[PDB]
């Protein structure tokens, strides 16, 4: 019956368009050759914070790319300048964690950016402590994300949904941010139903939103590390102007 068919709606042309746009936006903002990494302060392994200049540069570059992606998300530009800023301040670290899954490798459980010097493992990232609260769960998070085996379309939708979250602290037009997110969420749900076969599809939407919950917790845990570190002005000195502006001083 037409009545039953309307209940299971295929992906609209507008939904396919949203996906096209987010994929193009990602491809513009994520270089899988990591060529720009050569311009960062060098990684030093040999204080136990010797990697901080390099990882500061890596994060600061990655904030810049996240901003470029965010700007392309449909509807983002209709927000006020203020909500744009608060959404990006709040999400940046989570989108960086999420986008990092593309360099993460199960083989040695590290982020592999194409060089041994630009390969980052548990020993490098654990140097500033918070191993139980932040580092181990971040690695767990990277493993869980690989296990989901997302289509690139799901990956770009999840970054966008992450950014446009109405419950972020300081948001003014919560209704508008919710409406933009719902359009994205509904694209994702229909995408999964239409294009993601079982058994990988099973509960895939719910599992993806659970990854957004886990990211809120990682965000909190990193914020605690950041406040501890940055409280020593000699650490904050090794950071970048964009990191200070976006994450606070």
């Amino acid at each position: 019956s037409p009545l039953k068919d309307s209940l299971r709606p295929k992906l609209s042309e507008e939904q396919q368009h949203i996906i096209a746009i987010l994929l193009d936006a990602h491809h513009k903002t994520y270089d899988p050759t990591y060529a720009d990494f050569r311009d960062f302060r060098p990684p030093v392994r040999m204080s136990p914070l010797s990697m901080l200049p390099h990882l500061a540069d890596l994060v600061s570059y990655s904030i810049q790319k996240v901003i470029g992606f965010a700007k392309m998300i449909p509807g983002f530009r209709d927000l006020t300048s203020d909500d744009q800023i608060v959404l990006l301040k709040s999400s940046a670290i989570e989108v960086i964690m999420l986008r990092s899954n593309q360099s993460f490798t199960m083989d040695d459980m590290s982020w592999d950016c194409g060089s041994q010097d630009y390969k980052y493992d548990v020993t490098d990232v654990s140097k500033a402590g918070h191993t139980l609260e932040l580092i181990e769960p971040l690695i767990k998070f990277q493993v869980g994300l690989k296990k989901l085996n997302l289509h690139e379309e799901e990956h770009v939708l999840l970054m966008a949904i992450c950014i446009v979250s109405p419950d972020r602290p300081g948001v003014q037009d919560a209704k508008l941010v919710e409406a933009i997110q719902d359009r994205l969420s509904n694209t994702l749900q229909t995408y999964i139903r239409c294009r993601h076969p079982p058994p990988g599809s099973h509960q895939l939407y719910a599992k993806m939103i659970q990854k957004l919950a886990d990211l809120r917790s990682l965000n909190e845990e990193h914020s605690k590390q950041y406040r501890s570190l940055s409280f020593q002005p000699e650490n904050s000195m090794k950071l970048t102007p964009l990191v200070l502006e976006v994450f606070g001083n």
Partner: peptide
């Protein structure tokens, strides 16, 4: 919120 750099990257 005074974020000239973020604001500049946004525009």
């Amino acid at each position: 919120k005074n974020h000239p750099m973020l604001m500049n990257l946004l525009k």
